[PDB]
Structure formats: structure tokens, C-alpha cells
Amino acid sequence: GKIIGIDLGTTNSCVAIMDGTTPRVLENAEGDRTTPSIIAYTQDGETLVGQPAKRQAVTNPQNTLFAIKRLIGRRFQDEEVQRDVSIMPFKIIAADNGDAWVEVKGQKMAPPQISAEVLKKMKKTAEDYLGEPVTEAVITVPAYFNDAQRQATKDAGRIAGLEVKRIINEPTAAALAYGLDKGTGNRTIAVYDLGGGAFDISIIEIDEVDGEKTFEVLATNGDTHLGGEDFDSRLINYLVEEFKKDQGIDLRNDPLAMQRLKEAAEKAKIELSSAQQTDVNLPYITADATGPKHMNIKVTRAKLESLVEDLVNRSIEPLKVALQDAGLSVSDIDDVILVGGQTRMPMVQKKVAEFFGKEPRKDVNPDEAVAIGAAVQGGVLTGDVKDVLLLDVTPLSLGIETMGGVMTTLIAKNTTIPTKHSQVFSTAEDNQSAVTIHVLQGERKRAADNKSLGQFNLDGINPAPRGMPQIEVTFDIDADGILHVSAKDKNSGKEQKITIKASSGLNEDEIQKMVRDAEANAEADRKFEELVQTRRLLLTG
Ligand SMILES: Nc1ncnc2c1ncn2[C@@H]1O[C@H](COP(=O)(O)OP(=O)(O)OP(=O)(O)O)[C@@H](O)[C@H]1O
């Protein structure tokens, strides 16, 4: 019946539910509206997840798993994983198919089984609160996720025993919370998503027409080098040099010290959004030949702002990129929303306040906003929320190059994504051995008039006197907005395919110039295609 929304965070998870008209964030078993995303394997053969798993990490670096959201769906030879292999204290291994897996206590295990454990805790958190079993779910993912990662997010839920009703991306989920507030229609909003694992900026339009509120993403892009875990690194490296300057010991090579130090580094970081000072007292952190060593160093707040200013500045070019892709001016941008626990630090809000010239909205809970919005999607699916429409549509038509230099339209503008449709084409020459599929986007009928987005060949077409082999062309734009083009020659069984990425933005000012141009040029476009018909649509070499 009801469909729950889950914030799958790198660092914390959060559960919320629609209680009629107003959303409620549900507490986990400790009473916390957020649960750390950490998994631990104890000597006694049981697996800890959440706040219990976080606590035993300092003595169990190999069998305490955290930051598993950085491992799901990727190949081992990726640079950051090699970057990740060196810094992480637990064991990273390759799966038989080349996937990135982990191995704990001699058991080779994939991340989705591990992440499924948190959902079961979230599931049990929901089951204890509701007193009944729960099985239908909408799950969130980052906006920069590719084709392989989202499907893997669906599968992980199934290993946790869930039917995944919807995948939605995380910057979109947090915004649903904001739109419950009054006065949110007909505005342009920016979703700046800075988590533990990455930077994300999304541009979203909130429109309301004829009693229906519609939401459309105008731009998105991401940068995985600007996430909250990269900030913690910017402290682990420095802290060793101050002790080394005073007493000559390099801690980078001591994981047990590194395990307490990250915990000391992580918990204190929360404090500096509210606080101005504190003293780190971690007795017996290590020792050398002359006996025990003790940490006691006083340090305030300014130095950190000096240390991480470049990360904020390197996130700006992705912000600058987002506005061009959406085609908007600052004067079209109506509101600022903070999501994520790290925005409670004052300089980021000021750096944002200087940039936007207005204070970010203070009514969005940074630890809970993502979870609250995902719960709304469940109410839409059950009918609990009325007069709301998820808008995800194509700005321009998509197609392939055909006979005579003609574009044949396969997908008309403003069709909802995901989508798939089929059409039959044939061969142009006797005994034709090859075809070129030139993937094209635009509103003009001449193929030579569109932008090259890529092109591909399909071979193995059986020889025939022209037009007999039957080559079926499929374009698939999946729920991530990514276009999958596939081809199978039905008489032989062969299959080849390509993938075409989702756009980072939708530039309507330039698009609207092209559309008005197209209305003015309608008659010029017909005669060319009809005289190509004059000279089943055909594909060139
Ligand atoms: N009070 C606080 N002050 C400063 N930083 C905080 C606070 N609470 C949490 N953080 C930081 O915010 C980050 C987690 O934010 P959030 O839970 O929204 O991320 P996520 O959804 O887990 O990440 P991603 O979107 O990349 O998957 C962590 O770096 C954590 O250290």
C-alpha cells in the first residue's frame, strides 16, 4: 500500500513518513533522526550496523565498514579507488568479473549486501514504529549517478527484501520537503548537494499550473573531489605535522591512531558549526621507546577556513557551469535551500550569502531534508497527496541519419523520461555489409543540420538485393535520462548497442530561439524531406 522514501547517504541515513498532510521524521532505535552508515564485524561473528558499528571502528579497522556509498557499482581500475585502496584501513578486493568488492574475515562480499543491512535497520526502524511489515520503497541516489549505479541501488534493496517502487536522485528528493511550505509555486530553485562523497549542484524549476504543481530539473553536474570525506582528509594530513614538529612522530602509518584520530576529527567538526574552541584529549594514542605519548593541543576555527577555502572555490566553477546549462540569470533564481549537515558551518553560508546576496532558507533541516522529501513520493503513489506532478521531459527531439541526409524523428519534444519506441529501417545497397547510425538531436529535418553526438556501426547484416535484411533500431532513455541506443539484426541474432548520457543542463534561451526559428521555417523543412522521398526510410553507409 504505502511506499516509504529512504535517504541513502554516504555518512547518515534518515527515515520519514507522510502522516496525512504533514511529514514526520521517524527515530531509529537509539532515538536519533539520523543513523550513521557504518558497518562493523565483531570477533563474535555478528555484524554491527549504524551507531553500534561506528563505535568499535577504532579497534577494528579492517572489519568496520564505512563510506560504502563510495564503492557501489564501480570498476577496480578507477583512479579514486586506487586512491581509496591506499587510504582505507580495511581490505579492498576485486570480484571475479572485475567489480570492486570488499573482503572481511575471509568472506568475499559485495557492497549491496552490506548496504542492505542498513535498509533492514531502516526497515526494522519502520517496522517497529509501524508494528507491521513494510515492503514498497522509493530509494534515493546522487544526481550524477550513471546507468549501472541506479539499477544496483534497486538490487541492493531486493537483497534487503524490498520492492523498489521508484529510484529518484538525491538533490531532487530534498526539494520535495521545501514544496510543502506555502508559496513555493512558479519559482526557480538551485539544489546544491554537498555530501560526504561528492559535490552536486542541480537547477530545478518549480512550476504550478491549473492546480497541478510541476517540478523540472534545469541543470545538474557533480564533482567527486569536493565531498565531505575530502574535507576530513584536509585535517588528517595536517594534524600529524604539528605533533611531528614538537615530538618527531609521523602518524600517517599508524591505523589504530588513525582510527581514533578520524573519530576525534569527525566529532569535533560538527562542534565548529556551533562552537569557537575545544581541546582534543585522547590519552595513550601511541608510545615509543621512552614510554607513553599523549595528545593535548588547543586550536580554534580560522585556520580551517583558510585550509578549505579552495574546495568552496573549486565548487564554484561547477556552480558557474550549472547556470549556463540552464540558460538563466540570477534575476530568474528565486530561492536558496540548505541541505546537508555541513551547511551549519557559518563561513559556507556567508560564502553562499556573498554569492547569492540573500540568506539561505532557515526552515530546511539539513540532516532530515533528503529523507522528508522521499516520503512525499510515497504519498503521491498512494494518492495521499493531491494535485502534484513529477515533470521530467525532453527539451528537443532525438533521431538518426537517414537517406538523403534526412533526420527521421523517433522521439518528439516534451515526451516524459524514461521512454522507448520502435521503428523499422532497411539497407540502401545490394549485398550491403555495413550501416552508420548517426545519433542526432534537434528540430530540423536535414541530417547535415544537426550536432554530432556520436555514431556507431552494426555489422553482420546478411547480403541481399536491396532492402531485405531487417535491422531494428532502439533508443532508450532510462529513468536517469540516459539514452540507450541498441541494435539487433533479427535474421542473424547479433546484438550491438551504445549508451548516450543524460544532459547536464537544459538551455531554454538558446532552445527557445531555435523553436521560434522552427515555426518560421516550417515550409522550408517539408520540401527537402519530400524530395528525398522523391529522389521505409534508409540509412547510409
Ligand atoms: N553539525 C554538523 N556540522 C558540520 N558538518 C556536519 C554536521 N553533521 C554532519 N556533517 C557532515 O555532513 C556530511 C554528511 O551529510 P549528509 O548526511 O547529507 O551526506 P550524504 O547524503 O551521506 O552524502 P552524499 O550525498 O554524497 O551521498 C558528513 O561529512 C558529516 O561529517
Residue 343 CA to ligand 1 centre (angstroms): 9
Nearest CA to ligand 1 atom 23: 195
Cα-Cα-Cα-Cα torsion 163, 164, 165, 168, nearest 10 degrees, comes to 170
Report the nearest atom of ligand 1 relative to the CA of 229: 29
The DSSP symbol for 97 reads T
Residue 11 CA to ligand 1 centre (angstroms): 6
| Binding pocket residue ranges, ligand 1, CB within 6 Å | 9-12, 69, 142, 170, 193, 195-198, 227-228, 266, 269-270, 273, 340-342, 344-345
The DSSP element (H or E) to which 102 belongs, if any, is strand 100-104
Q: What is the spatial distance between Cα 105 and Cα 96, in angstroms, rounded to a whole number?
A: 18
Write the burial class of residue 363 (CB in 10 Å: 0-12 exposed, 13-18 middle, 19+ buried).
exposed
Beta-strand relationship, 22-26 and 12-19: antiparallel
Resolution limit in angstroms?
Answer: 7.7
486-518 as b/e, with b when 16 or more CB fall inside 10 Å? Answer: bbbbeeeeeeeeeebebbbbbbeeeeeeeeeee
Nearest CA to ligand 1 atom 8: 341
Q: Which of 269, 272, 364 for mutating ligand 1's site (highest number of atoms within 8 Å of CB)?
A: 269
- Count of positions (residues) in the chain: 541
- Structural determination approach: X-ray
The DSSP symbol for 341 reads G
Report the nearest atom of ligand 1 relative to the CA of 228: 29
Q: What is the spatial distance between Cα 17 and Cα 19, in angstroms, rounded to a whole number?
A: 6
Measured CA to CA in angstroms, residue 67 lies from 33, 88, 196, 202 at distances of 19, 10, 8, 23
- How many C-beta atoms lie closer than 10 Å to residue 302's C-beta? 10
Look up residue 142 and give its three cell numbers.
Answer: 546522487
The widest CA-to-CA distance across the chain, in whole angstroms, is: 95
Q: What is the spatial distance between Cα 188 and Cα 202, in angstroms, rounded to a whole number?
A: 11
In this structure, are residues 254 and 293 in contact, taking their beta carbons and an 8 Å threshold?
A: no
Report the nearest atom of ligand 1 relative to the CA of 7: 21
Collect all residues with Cβ–Cβ distance below 8 Å to 71 and sequence separation of at least 6: 81, 84, 100, 102, 111
Give the residues after which the backbone of the chain is interrupted, taking a C-to-next-N distance over 2.5 angstroms as a break.
Answer: 535
Look up residue 158 and give its three cell numbers.
Answer: 531486493
Q: Helix (H, G, I), strand (E, B), or coil: what is residue 27?
A: coil
Collect all residues with Cβ–Cβ distance below 8 Å to 289 and sequence separation of at least 6: none
Nearest CA to ligand 1 atom 20: 9
Q: What is the spatial distance between Cα 117 and Cα 160, in angstroms, rounded to a whole number?
A: 6
Checking phi first, is residue 203 left (phi over 0); if not, alpha (psi -120 to 50) or beta?
beta
Residue in 61, 63, 58 with CA at minimum distance from that of residue 44: 63
- HSE-up of residue 437 (Cα within 13 Å, Cβ side): 24
Q: Helix (H, G, I), strand (E, B), or coil: what is residue 118?
A: helix
Domains of the chain: 4-226+315-390 (3.30.420.40), 229-307 (3.90.640.10), 398-534 (2.60.34.10)
Q: How far does the chain reach from its first CA to its final CA, in angstroms?
A: 53
Q: What is the spatial distance between Cα 199 and Cα 197, in angstroms, rounded to a whole number?
A: 7
Q: What is the spatial distance between Cα 501 and Cα 484, in angstroms, rounded to a whole number?
A: 8
Report the nearest atom of ligand 1 relative to the CA of 193: 25
Q: Helix (H, G, I), strand (E, B), or coil: what is residue 385?
A: coil
Q: What is the spatial distance between Cα 24 and Cα 411, in angstroms, rounded to a whole number?
A: 41
Q: What is the spatial distance between Cα 483 and Cα 503, in angstroms, rounded to a whole number?
A: 10
Nearest CA to ligand 1 atom 18: 340
H, E, C per residue of 34-73? CEECEEEECCCCCEEECHHHHHCHHHCCCCEEECHHHCCC
The CA radius of gyration of the chain, in Å to the nearest whole number, is 27
The DSSP element (H or E) to which 221 belongs, if any, is strand 212-223
**Interior angle at CA 361, CA 356 and CA 365, nearest 5:** 135
Report the nearest atom of ligand 1 relative to the CA of 14: 17
Q: Which of 6, 8, 12, 266 for mutating ligand 1's site (highest number of atoms within 8 Å of CB)?
A: 12
Residue 4 CA to ligand 1 centre (angstroms): 22
Q: Helix (H, G, I), strand (E, B), or coil: what is residue 481?
A: coil
Q: What is the spatial distance between Cα 302 and Cα 344, in angstroms, rounded to a whole number?
A: 16
- HSE-up of residue 461 (Cα within 13 Å, Cβ side): 27
- How many C-beta atoms lie closer than 10 Å to residue 175's C-beta? 24
DSSP track, 482-498:
-EEEEEEETTT--EEEE
Look up residue 424 and give its three cell numbers.
Answer: 523499422
Q: Tally DSSP H helices, then E strands, for the chain.
A: 13, 27
Q: Helix (H, G, I), strand (E, B), or coil: what is residue 254?
A: coil
Residue 228 CA to ligand 1 centre (angstroms): 6
Q: What is the spatial distance between Cα 10 and Cα 267, in angstroms, rounded to a whole number?
A: 16
Look up residue 380 and give its three cell numbers.
Answer: 503521491
Measured CA to CA in angstroms, residue 511 lies from 186, 300, 449, 531 at distances of 20, 50, 15, 28
Look up residue 293 and give its three cell numbers.
Answer: 605519548
Q: Which of 10, 199, 367, 368 for mutating ligand 1's site (highest number of atoms within 8 Å of CB)?
A: 10
Nearest CA to ligand 1 atom 17: 12
The DSSP element (H or E) to which 439 belongs, if any, is strand 435-441
Q: What is the spatial distance between Cα 217 and Cα 292, in angstroms, rounded to a whole number?
A: 57
Collect all residues with Cβ–Cβ distance below 8 Å to 168 and sequence separation of at least 6: 138, 139, 140, 141, 374, 377
Collect all residues with Cβ–Cβ distance below 8 Å to 443 and sequence separation of at least 6: 396, 397, 413, 514, 515, 518
Residue in 116, 102, 142 with CA at minimum distance from that of residue 10: 142
In this structure, are residues 343 and 354 in contact, taking their beta carbons and an 8 Å threshold?
A: no
Q: Which of 6, 7, 11, 230 for mutating ligand 1's site (highest number of atoms within 8 Å of CB)?
A: 11
Partner residues linked to 194 by β-bridges: 199
Nearest CA to ligand 1 atom 25: 195
Look up residue 18 and give its three cell numbers.
Answer: 507522510
Residue 176 CA to ligand 1 centre (angstroms): 19
At how many degrees (to 10) do helices 522-534 and 508-520 cross? 70
Q: What is the spatial distance between Cα 376 and Cα 173, in angstroms, rounded to a whole number?
A: 9
Measured CA to CA in angstroms, residue 531 lies from 180, 403, 427, 535 at distances of 55, 11, 19, 6
Residue in 145, 204, 442, 150 with CA at minimum distance from that of residue 322: 204
Nearest CA to ligand 1 atom 7: 341
Q: What is the spatial distance between Cα 335 and Cα 200, in angstroms, rounded to a whole number?
A: 17
Which of the residues are catalytic? 7, 69, 170, 193
Residue 137 CA to ligand 1 centre (angstroms): 23
Nearest CA to ligand 1 atom 24: 195
Which residue reads 554569492 in cell numbers? Answer: 355
Report the nearest atom of ligand 1 relative to the CA of 266: 31
